[PDB]
Amino acid sequence: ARLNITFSPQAFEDYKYFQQNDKKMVKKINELLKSIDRNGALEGIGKPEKLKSNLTGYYSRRINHEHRLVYTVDDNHIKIASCKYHY
Amino acid sequence: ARLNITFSPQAFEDYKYFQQNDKKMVKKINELLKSIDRNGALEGIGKPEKLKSNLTGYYSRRINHEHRLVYTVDDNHIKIASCKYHY
Amino acid sequence: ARLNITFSPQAFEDYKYFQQNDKKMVKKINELLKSIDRNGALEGIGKPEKLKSNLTGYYSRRINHEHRLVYTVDDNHIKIASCKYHY
């Protein structure tokens, strides 16, 4: 409710795919986004983790056993890089 | 496909409202965003118009008879202020 | 095929009443529930309307000429209050 939500082009295509083919995933993504806005990057549902990366700043939360939401947070927005990530 | 999609808190609330109530309205919004990305702020479907009041540099496109999508564009993102606007 | 279906005690009584006395009504109710899940609360068969009052955030869809299905929705379920409603 406080932060803007920014989808990368790929993330929004992922999101629209789930709108058409797996609405349960859309609902879970929306719940994860509410938790991020309320609690911050690292606390809440979805087993939040720092992204295994050589670049700091990105985190992930479990949508289901196969797919994680990958995102970063600042004072202005949650930026979503992917809705289908798996290491 | 080129620009990020940024939902303001009110816009994402509107978007989820249509996810719960009228999935054809979600489809139309997604189509409007594709046209903005491909054709620019004022070119394409939905009778694009400049927004004259209360916001600077924003535009609107018709979703249906009662609701317009209100947005602005730069070369990084489309920023959506509302999916329920009416003058 | 995603949302849980919750019957209030009265709605399940109505539903079982039609199971015994008018199977034609049960068939239409099941179709309405599928449409709500597929299209959202306010789109599809049954002339969906918001319920002005008597509850908060409820909707109705026509079953037959005399009776409407009254329900609400959230992320998790369709909740049915009545299968026999008339204003």
UniProtKB/TrEMBL annotation, chains A, B, C:
SUPFAM superfamilies (UniProt xref): RelE-like (SSF143011)
Annotated InterPro entries: RelE/ParE_toxin_dom_sf, YoeB_toxin
Keyword terms: Endonuclease, Hydrolase, Nuclease, RNA-binding, Toxin-antitoxin system
GO BP terms in the entry: negative regulation of DNA-templated transcription; RNA catabolic process
Domain of life: Bacteria
Function: Toxic component of a type II toxin-antitoxin (TA) system. Has RNase activity and preferentially cleaves at the 3'-end of purine ribonucleotides.
Similarity section: Belongs to the YoeB family.
Record protein name field: Toxin YoeB
